[PDB]
Amino acid sequence: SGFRKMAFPSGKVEGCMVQVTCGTTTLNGLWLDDVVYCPRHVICTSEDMLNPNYEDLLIRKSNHNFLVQAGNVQLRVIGHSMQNCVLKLKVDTANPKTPKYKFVRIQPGQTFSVLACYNGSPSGVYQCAMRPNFTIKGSFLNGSCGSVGFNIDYDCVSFCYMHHMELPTGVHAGTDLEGNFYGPFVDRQTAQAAGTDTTITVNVLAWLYAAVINGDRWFLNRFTTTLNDFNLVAMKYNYEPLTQDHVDILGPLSAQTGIAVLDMCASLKELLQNGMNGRTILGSALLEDEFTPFDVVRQC
Amino acid sequence: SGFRKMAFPSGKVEGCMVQVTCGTTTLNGLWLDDVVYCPRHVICTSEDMLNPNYEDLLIRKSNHNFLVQAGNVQLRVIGHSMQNCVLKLKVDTANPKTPKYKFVRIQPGQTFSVLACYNGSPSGVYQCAMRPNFTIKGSFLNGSCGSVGFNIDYDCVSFCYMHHMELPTGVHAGTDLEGNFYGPFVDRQTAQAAGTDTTITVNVLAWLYAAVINGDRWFLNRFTTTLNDFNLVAMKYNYEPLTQDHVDILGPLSAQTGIAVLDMCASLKELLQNGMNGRTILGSALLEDEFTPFDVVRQC
Ligand SMILES: Cc1cc(-n2c(CC(C)C)nc3cc(O)c(O)c(O)c3c2=O)ccc1F
Ligand SMILES: Cc1cc(-n2c(CC(C)C)nc3cc(O)c(O)c(O)c3c2=O)ccc1F
Q: What does the similarity note say (chains A, B) (predicted)?
């Protein structure tokens, strides 16, 4: 029993975190086989950021401009190149702690764990969702660039996020591990801001199921709604539309609790229209939307 | 910016988790140097639990009754003994991944990370507080016994919790690593239940400071209160009394935000008397009490 925001064990990723220094900037890098991945703005000075031509700055660099430290051991950089917004520093040593890994890009609404790092040293691990507006509500101080997000499946680490910058509202923007930003953000100084966000409906539903599995039942009722009538209510309250595919995905959880998806939607409609009247669900007074259906099955 | 429930990187603890089987029971063990630590009820059958004499059950055991598996490698048990409520299985191999470690007992109100494990395999990591009633609000399914709680300080893992059982309200009870239970709980079948709980005041205050550091300010005000007048309000709302030592501990956070502790107490008094009026603090509609002052400084 119990339900917590649970990250994946981070050990497999901790063994890949290194420190990359170029000029006066030190940030974090991901060391897999004989390649070190890090944000390309490591090659920039502060005054470069207005309109950096990264093609410029990189040709003006050479291997010895990059100091790579794995723990106490210096790694010798033997090659450098750019892929989109990440830098690939080829080193002379394959990381013996390289786990089986994948570079996958996630969808808004999916979750992952973040290993927050400073100077190549892991500091903490926590769960995140990719928001519908492609930001993440992380916890990052200056120095955390290069920290990565990931899922683990059996033995295989699927890296999905690298941290690049904080936006003006305090949320976070980054790339997949091929260097392509999530969302309409760039690694140069602009007034870029997070777009408007929505609540991830299928996740809220999944979390309600986690609540029923854990003995919270006060919000259940005898009503059902149609998918169309629920979606009218969702749009009013700034929730993603619910699709039949979401309904299908919630199936297992529906079967385990004996509460039909559209039966649970009726409860969600009541919660949105009436609030909670001073009660809580799984220790929260808000509707939580950063647990996927998979996260719930995983933990329950 | 941002503020999340952040666990410590679990890699150092993952390398110590093993699987301990005795009879038909398989649970988790902590492998440090040439000793494997696990709950002593691993030697019990279900029908033993009414009034087990653990001195009994253990003398009726021998080394080969205990199967210890570290990943795929079987560990040979060469000694067994009981210390309070934990079993110490001496094995013929010192764990080469033994970190620097300590066995420390924590106080109610302190926090730690839990590496939830099944069959010796780490499943997830998350943050917990030891409640004032010595339970923890964890996330544990059957099979999770032997999972440990810990803090990390520099390079040193201070183990503070081993999981033993779930209580009827769904909260969790366990021991320190010397086998002494937190709170008035026993590893035998009774109607034992969590005692009444209170809210950890100094932590709520710390979290309010984390909120001010992150730009949440709507709950601040120009009032101050006396320590005694705040404590009258705390007792009414089932909050721990606030001591001068708590006030001292909050000092750094007070200095960093320029908000005097008793100034923040006045805000806490208003929040308790009026609620939040539909607003949120750090994404929560409840007053959070599972961040210590240290947790806040650590993350901010
Ligand atoms: C103005 C601006 C700054 C950055 N920037 C840079 C780039 C540097 C040359 C100032 N380096 C970082 C390093 C970190 O370790 C970190 O955590 C960060 O957030 C940043 C970061 O944001 C990115 C785009 C921009 F338009
Ligand atoms: C009735 C009762 C059960 C237990 N008990 C036992 C003991 C076993 C012989 C049934 N083994 C566990 C193994 C886990 O892996 C786990 O997660 C658990 O919660 C337990 C657990 O609770 C402890 C005291 C009790 F009075």
A: Belongs to the coronaviruses polyprotein 1ab family.
